[PDB]
Amino acid sequence: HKAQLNKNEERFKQLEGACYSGKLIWKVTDYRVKKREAVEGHTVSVFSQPFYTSRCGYRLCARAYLNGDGSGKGTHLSLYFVVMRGEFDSLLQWPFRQRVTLMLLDQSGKKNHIVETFKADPNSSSFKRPDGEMNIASGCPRFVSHSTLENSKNTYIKDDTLFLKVAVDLTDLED
Amino acid sequence: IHKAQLNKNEERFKQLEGACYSGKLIWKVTDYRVKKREAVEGHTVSVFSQPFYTSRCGYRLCARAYLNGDGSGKGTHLSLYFVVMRGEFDSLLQWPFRQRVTLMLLDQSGKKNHIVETFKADPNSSSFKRPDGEMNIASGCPRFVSHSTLENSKNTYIKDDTLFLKVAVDLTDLED
Amino acid sequence: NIHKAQLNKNEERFKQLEGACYSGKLIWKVTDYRVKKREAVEGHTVSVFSQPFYTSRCGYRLCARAYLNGDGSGKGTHLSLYFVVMRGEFDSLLQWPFRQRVTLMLLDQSGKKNHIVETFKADPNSSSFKRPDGEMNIASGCPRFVSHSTLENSKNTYIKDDTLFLKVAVDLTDLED
């Protein structure tokens, strides 16, 4: 029943977190502790709640490696995009072909955000129609360096929390 | 008294997971064979969609299908019906319900050769009065699509034992 | 013992999810008027709350609060209707103070659409509109929004079947999503 209460808790969390315009804003609290868990190998990565391109479109989410992954292991925050298995995948166009933009938000008001954008590569297996729970992640292992992110004269972290944003271009999507 | 609690939860979760607010419903029906079997055996004559809405505070609605057909299409067609349900804000809404409605079975082949029937809601119909109980009498097409066309081995209305039904309400001249 | 608190926590979470809106627009159905006003008068339950609503999925969290038996300036004689900025998950990214026009309404159920509407610009100096510090800023609105007299009469149709509808609408002008 602890498994039942956790199942509930998670379901609640997804419902509370779902967005339906291909736009995700992901609040990451307790930075220091979570990075600590990354460094200690306790909890390598964190996930966003699932979001969607439209109520009945692609199910998606983001994943971050606070202490970096592969190419940015130990030195950067690694930010990855993820196509999940969606309830209506059969009606959707495959491969996934939308432009995607990844962001770390400047909380200073100067709106000096860190943004990387790209066109989804049709040959990538990240964008095939998913087979299990979710396709292989794809994005920037070296999205932003710990140095820039954590630097005191910066405001990417405020009160031990940062905000990540994913935005999917909906151009030429049916719905 | 807690299996009823867990089921009450499960259903509430299901409705929340299923709700749409633009008068548009896409209804995935999985396990076709088994469900049609249940229809034929008289075990489970009909199936319902989760409630959807014209707007967050508009009409509450849903769809209902008789996989083994109903009345005029009994035993030979899939019967697809539209349903006005009792809404939380019915007092603020215009009655009778007067919107054009479109019913669809989706072509999964990519040729987008869907089956679509549309109609204007008849004001004199009691399907469209402000609801009295849980939901007004259903209204639609008892003979929406024949088993023959639907199940046709060379067709793609059923793929991997699942089909998709779509209801679309015209929102013209409605407020939120 | 603790699990009644669990079941209530659930119940409320469910209620918020069922109630949330994301266009700065709230329609608040108030059922069981007579009984709730009774509770107000008896000091049992002075005020009632709406479920939280939002300017956008990631915007300001807000809600409404009513004193059925009135509050302060309208205590005992009016329904008092107040607007409330709550602590939002993304408050750090939002502009402060809150600066949007707000409109408060009691809806005419007769069809004549003769609603009672009060509107105002949010005063930047007001502490109702600072970035919230706890669960929610001090409420602000109309202690004398509508008199029991007007609200309760028969020829009027602000109450029908012992239930009334309140509406809050926030102007989204100059608010990027």
**Is the minimum CB–CB distance between C13 and chain A shorter than 8 Å?**
yes
- How many angstroms separate the CA atoms of B123 and B119, rounded? 12
What residues contact B43, with CB distance under 8 A and at least 6 apart?
B37
Q: b/e map of C59-91 (b: 16 or more CB within 10 Å)?
A: bbbbbbbbbbbbbeebeeebbbbbbbbbebbbe
Lookup: tokens for C151: 């609200």
- Judge: C165–B91 Cβ closer than 8 Å, yes or no: yes
Tell me how close the Cα of B132 comes to any Cα of chain A, in angstroms: 30
Q: Which residue of C has its CA nearest to A13?
A: C13
Q: Which amino acid is at A72?
A: G
Q: Which residue of A has its CA nearest to C56?
A: A19
Lookup: tokens for A133: 């729970």
* Subunit partners of chain A (3 or more CB pairs within 8 A): B, C
- How many angstroms separate the CA atoms of B53 and B21, rounded? 5
- How many angstroms separate the CA atoms of B165 and B30, rounded? 11
Alpha carbon of residue C164 to chain centroid? 13
Q: How far is CA B143 from CA A69, B79, B119, in A?
A: 57, 6, 14
Helix (H) or strand (E) holding A148: helix A146-150
- How many angstroms separate the CA atoms of B152 and A11, rounded? 38
Interface of C with B in 130-169 (CB under 8 A): 160-161, 163, 165
Which candidate from A55, A87, A91 shows the least CB-CB separation from B106? A91
- Per CATH, the number for A1-175 is 2.60.210.10
Contact (CB, 8 A) for A52 and A19: yes
What's the residue count for chain A?
A: 175
- How many angstroms separate the CA atoms of B121 and B99, rounded? 6
Q: Are strands C78-85 and C53-54 parallel, antiparallel or unpaired?
A: unpaired
Tell me how close the Cα of A91 comes to any Cα of chain B, in angstroms: 6
Residues of chain B in contact with residue A20, where contact means CB-CB under 8 angstroms, are: none
- For chain B, the straight-line distance linking the first and the last C-alpha, in angstroms and rounded, comes to 39
What does residue B90 show for φ and ψ, rounded to 5 degrees?
A: -55, -35
- How many angstroms separate the CA atoms of C166 and C107, rounded? 6
Q: b/e map of A1-29 (b: 16 or more CB within 10 Å)?
A: eeeeeeebeeebeebebbbbbbbbbbbbe
| C1-177 CATH pick, 2.40.37.10, 2.60.210.10, 3.30.450.40, 3.40.50.10490 | 2.60.210.10
DSSP state for residue A121 in the 8-state scheme: -
The label of the residue with tokens 């992954």 reads A69
Lookup: tokens for A5: 């209460």
- How many angstroms separate the CA atoms of A164 and A104, rounded? 5
Contact (CB, 8 A) for B93 and B58: yes
- Judge: A15–B16 Cβ closer than 8 Å, yes or no: yes
Tell me the structure's resolution in angstroms, rounded to a single decimal: 2.8
Tell me how close the Cα of B32 comes to any Cα of chain C, in angstroms: 31
What residues contact C129, with CB distance under 8 A and at least 6 apart?
C85, C96, C97, C98, C99, C122, C123, C137, C140
- How many angstroms separate the CA atoms of B98 and B117, rounded? 17
- How many angstroms separate the CA atoms of C106 and C116, rounded? 5
* Subunit partners of chain C (3 or more CB pairs within 8 A): A, B
Q: Give me the residue spans of the domains in chain B.
A: 1-176
- Judge: A91–B16 Cβ closer than 8 Å, yes or no: no
Mutation to test the B interface, candidates A90, A93, A174, most B Cβ within 10 Å: A90
Q: b/e map of C19-48 (b: 16 or more CB within 10 Å)?
A: bbbbbbbbbbbbeebeebbebbeeeeeeeb
Other residues' Cβ atoms within 10 Å of the Cβ of residue B169: 23
Q: How far is CA C95 from CA A19, C91, C177, in A?
A: 21, 8, 12
Question: Can you say whether residue C162 is alpha, beta or left, with left for phi > 0 and alpha for psi between -120 and 50 degrees?
Answer: left
What's the residue count for chain C?
A: 177
**Is the minimum CB–CB distance between A16 and chain C shorter than 8 Å?**
yes
- How many angstroms separate the CA atoms of C17 and B15, rounded? 11
Helix (H) or strand (E) holding B148: helix B147-151
Helix axes B3-18, C3-19, angle to 10 degrees: 20
Lookup: tokens for C47: 């005020």
Which candidate from C10, C21, C163 shows the least CB-CB separation from B56? C21
Q: A46, A130, A134, A142: which is closest to A94 by C-alpha?
A: A130
**Is the minimum CB–CB distance between B57 and chain C shorter than 8 Å?**
yes
Burial class (CB in 10 A: 0-12, 13-18, 19+), B49: buried
Helix ranges, chain C (H): 3-19, 33-41, 148-152
**Is the minimum CB–CB distance between C50 and chain B shorter than 8 Å?**
no
Residues of chain B in contact with residue A56, where contact means CB-CB under 8 angstroms, are: 20, 26
Q: Does the domain at residues B1-176 carry the CATH identifier 2.70.180.20?
A: no
Experimental method: X-ray
* Subunit partners of chain B (3 or more CB pairs within 8 A): A, C
What residues contact B6, with CB distance under 8 A and at least 6 apart?
A4
Mutation to test the C interface, candidates B10, B88, B92, most C Cβ within 10 Å: B92
The secondary structure of C14-54 as a DSSP string is HHHHHH--SSSEEEEEE--HHHHHHHHHTTS---EEPPPEE
Which candidate from B16, B24, B108 shows the least CB-CB separation from A90? B108
What does residue A146 show for φ and ψ, rounded to 5 degrees?
A: -45, -40
